[PDB]
Amino acid sequence: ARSEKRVPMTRLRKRVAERLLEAKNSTAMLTTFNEVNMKPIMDLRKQYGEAFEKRHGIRLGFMSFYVKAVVEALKRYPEVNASIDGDDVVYHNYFDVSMAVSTPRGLVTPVLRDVDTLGMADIEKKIKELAVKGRDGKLTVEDLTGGNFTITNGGVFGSLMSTPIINPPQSAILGMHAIKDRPMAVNGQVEILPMMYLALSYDHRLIDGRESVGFLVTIKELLEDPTRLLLDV
Amino acid sequence: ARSEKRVPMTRLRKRVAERLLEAKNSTAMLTTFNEVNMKPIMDLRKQYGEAFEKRHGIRLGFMSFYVKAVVEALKRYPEVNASIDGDDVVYHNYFDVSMAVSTPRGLVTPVLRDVDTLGMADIEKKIKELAVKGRDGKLTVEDLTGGNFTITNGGVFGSLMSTPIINPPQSAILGMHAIKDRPMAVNGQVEILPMMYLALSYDHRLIDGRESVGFLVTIKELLEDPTRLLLDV
Amino acid sequence: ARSEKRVPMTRLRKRVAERLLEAKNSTAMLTTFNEVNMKPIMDLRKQYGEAFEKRHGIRLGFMSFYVKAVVEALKRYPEVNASIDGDDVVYHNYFDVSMAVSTPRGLVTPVLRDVDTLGMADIEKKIKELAVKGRDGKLTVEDLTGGNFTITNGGVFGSLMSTPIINPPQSAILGMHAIKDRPMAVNGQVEILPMMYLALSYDHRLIDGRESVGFLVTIKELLEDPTRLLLDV
Amino acid sequence: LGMADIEKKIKELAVKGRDGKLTVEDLTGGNFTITNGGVFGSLMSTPIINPPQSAILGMHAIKDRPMAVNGQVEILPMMYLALSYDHRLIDGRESVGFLVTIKELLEDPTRLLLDV
């Protein structure tokens, strides 16, 4: 009936909205974009999916490819794997990557620890585990604290492209989006490819234009041809 | 002659520039994007334009379609139709939408009240009325205050895509852009379609990634096929 | 060995990171985008490159075209050529344009002074000079102070599109990106063109949506057909 | 009622009238009637007015039939419509206009949104 409904914010949500605002005003976030042809990865899933699941007992998804690419990019650009703490820059000699998971009570980012030591099947398993816990609200504070970088996937909701927000106190975040067929120029000919836009938001106080672009280009190259991870080129 | 001209800012403009800065630093604005095929709407205007004007005494434009789509999206995502006031979230049980109109003295946003009760012809009429007033500076403070959301159209100036700024104290804004022919993938074939990019800037303190994307996807679906408004799918 | 390496920030870098943050929170930066077909300029370089170098003793690059376009846009939109100083708006009756150059010790922006008086060959020479100095760290404080606008080129690193950050105390910045073949709609037919996205970040306190879009559209028009600079249309 | 709500009410009444649980309240009233003989394969017919209403719309079977479309012949799923009306109250012009309106809104439901 009444034309307006006023609902008080809980004390928790009070200092949650009053934190991203503090952190968002404490960093110089910028966003850089690129695109990636997902055909190669989609073909690998179709060609080896059955045999992969039979051998590992887990389905080969897209996330393990993203994680592997992010780890390698994190190794090539240590500045992005770092954080700013007071008057110090803290470089991390390990690789923890936060992964956004939608829970009935919002969005949370459980941490995948030492992802650089995990094989692809193991990454898919950990992701499924954390996803299940965050689905049944059994995620612990231990599971949620930490991470040197974050990967969020809005493509599940049909997002074309967007500006992801940095996850405090990390220095950058990778936003994945929907994969959509789009006409592309390939060797002088136009052919339709399953394209996905990538967005990397980064704290310009620590990461410059050159490194943010190079970091995203590295992810693009490793996704368009996973074999590059083996050759290291 | 002099290499520099210093012009003092009026006292009004003083606290106008000193407000968007205050509000812009008080919110966590982010922007998400999508695209829409305007062919269906352009065909409806060509097919029914003449008969529409004869029956209603007003031309069928693009804006009434946008408003109808925004209202439905506002109904499906009440969080976007809300505002943050102090420690409270104010949900609005009505639909007022601010509409950006270029005036000889800048840009203003007159409000379309209870747009959800207006038929398309009635929406086009109100828009033309407010546009005329804002064109002859006869817009009153009453006409300018309020609104739960804003729609701004930069396409008039040839804009491809941009980041619109939130209109205080609203929580989100939809930026429309130029309609340009672009090769698209349609059922395995490449065909040229009149495409327009959409930008939705939103206050992340209140609207999360999932809702901002879902809200924009809803607008996209209702514009690519207005009939969906009738079926409610 | 240790899983973390803490490195103190120098006092200089202390108030460098503690400045872009101050300035970034003191302005209302927004970003607008567009795209440009570089085929015409690429054809001019191929057709006249040899004769240009023989007559001027310098190679005809892309930058002189960008500078010429930016100057003309700066003339058509004086608001963008201005700055905000306290309660005053300072309009500049000259044209100094900062140019981002990557140096072994970071990124710096030497200033091209009175670029509106320089011919294209002269612009290419000045750019090469400043680039060399900034390459051997022989850039003076005089060379680095000033500028009414900035042009930064991330395309060198393969950037598709991004949000450039405003260079204090200027009011806007133009970000150039990589040139990539992309299928486009040309006279009802699809043809592959060398496309580049453009990004213009601007201080909304001084520049409105209409002027930011018009400014970028002007650059686009002058780059897609440099002859327009002669006709002034 | 929204479209989903209309389909639900129709299914409800259909079930009741199928199990004879339709009440006199459910059966009295109505300003107009819609009857569908197409379920039985009817091509076209003259429906009879439901007292004390003034008109009734008869729907029939949908059958593929060659039609003229932009100078070309193409097969379309066509259905004949019949509107019986009490001429004491409704004249030729209004009966025809009423049926033409139904035809236009069915051939392009979007017209309901534009109101044209």
Curated annotation (Swiss-Prot), chain D:
The active site is at H87, D91. Signal peptide: none annotated. It comes from the Bacteria. Coiled coil: none annotated. Belongs to the 2-oxoacid dehydrogenase family. Forms a 24-polypeptide structural core with octahedral symmetry. Part of the 2-oxoglutarate dehydrogenase (OGDH) complex composed of E1 (2-oxoglutarate dehydrogenase), E2 (dihydrolipoamide succinyltransferase) and E3 (dihydrolipoamide dehydrogenase); the complex contains multiple copies of the three enzymatic components (E1, E2 and E3). Interacts with SucA (via N-terminus), the E1 component of OGDH complex. E2 component of the 2-oxoglutarate dehydrogenase (OGDH) complex which catalyzes the second step in the conversion of 2-oxoglutarate to succinyl-CoA and CO(2). This is Dihydrolipoyllysine-residue succinyltransferase component of 2-oxoglutarate dehydrogenase complex. It comes from Escherichia coli (strain K12). The lineage of its organism: Bacteria, Pseudomonadati, Pseudomonadota, Gammaproteobacteria, Enterobacterales. The gene is sucB. The chain holds residues 290 to 405 of 405 of the full protein.
